[PDB]
Amino acid sequence: GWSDHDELSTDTTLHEEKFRIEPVPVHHQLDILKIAVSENYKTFASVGLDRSLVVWDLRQWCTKLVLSKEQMPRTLKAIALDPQGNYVSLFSKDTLFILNVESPSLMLQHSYHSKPNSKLNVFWMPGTHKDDEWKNFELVVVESSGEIQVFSLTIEIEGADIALVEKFQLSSPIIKSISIVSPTANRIASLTESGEVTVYSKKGPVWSPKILSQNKNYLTETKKDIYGIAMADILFLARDSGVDMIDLKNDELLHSFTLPPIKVNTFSVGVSNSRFVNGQFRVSSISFCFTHAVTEKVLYYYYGNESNESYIILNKWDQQPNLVDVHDPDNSLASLTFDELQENIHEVEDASESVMSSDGLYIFGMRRKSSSGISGETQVWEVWMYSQSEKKHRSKSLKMYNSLIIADPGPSLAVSDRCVAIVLGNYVALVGYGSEIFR
Prior knowledge:
It is a single chain. The protein has one domain. 1% of the residues lie in helices and 55% in strands. The protein contains one helix and 37 strands. The protein has a five-stranded antiparallel beta sheet with strand order 1-34-33-32-31, with no helix packed on it. It has a four-stranded antiparallel beta sheet with strand order 2-37-36-35. A four-stranded antiparallel beta sheet has the order 3-4-5-6, with no helix packed on it. The longest helix is centred in the first third of the chain and has 5 residues. It is found in: Endoplasmic reticulum membrane; Golgi apparatus membrane.
């Protein structure tokens, strides 16, 4: 543990009781550098400054794989999990390693060209899997250089095989790449220093590129970020006076949200209560998180009247009308236009590390208020939450007696629609509201 003991006030309402913080029971010997979670939110990984790795089953509260610094390659350029949280891919400067985390073992090791000092982003995408017998994946490796490699990875009970199947080269360096595993296609989207976003999409056996268009009213703005909601087949392109929300299936600008200038690479999106009804991807709310390029403050913009009330149609399979007479679970609800969305803004003080839940409905944060020597030291932290839909803030004071934490909090990542992980030096805290993750 991170202290001799922690002290909190006893809860006086059921609402307070549901607001929870707990330490993850495992930790690293040096500060945590990087954290990640699988797409299905089952599996969490943390990587220390010393390359140590811990992979953790969130719902079962147990360790799946722990590797110390001396059990790891001496270089580690990237980590990634498959979308189901059963495999991890680790990349050193010259080697990739594929581990089974469900039944721990090394399935495969493969040597690979990297152009160091090349920065890597790695993504798993489903290929032609099915079922419990064998699985196929595409493993995509993106280099800041503009190089994109795609590997076909087959996994079996026994072991695995891999092959470099495609290689692409972009005309500019890559600021940011993302994967979109959509219902229509596997897609890789890259924002380059040119300001272009190039999307490579797979149809059948063949990848093809397209260059996306931002809102033509705003062509001189610097492009700052891209972010995808893969199941809606939507890409968000952030620039300096807003964000363009683009349908990648039918190639179509759906809306431009108005925002202040956004700091490069700091933008994310969550949407709530996602359901698909008669060709419509519907959500109850949309939330954006970004760092304001002027004030360097972290901001949360929340749009919507919330669930019990209305919904927003984010995208449609077919951008045509359709009088299908089928079951519509949202009958008693109002469909809203983009222009009649209500916008609520929450700005966070620099002192806090904050992060929103995966559906954008809750913001959580932590700040160290104070510390004092015992002759070790005692620290007072504030743990807080904000419910974006009820407009309700809650905070708990957390006193740590003989704390072993000397770092400022961060980095941080959503772990479910009601729970977040916040790094505290070499520990991680889970903070949530009414979350089944506890405990």
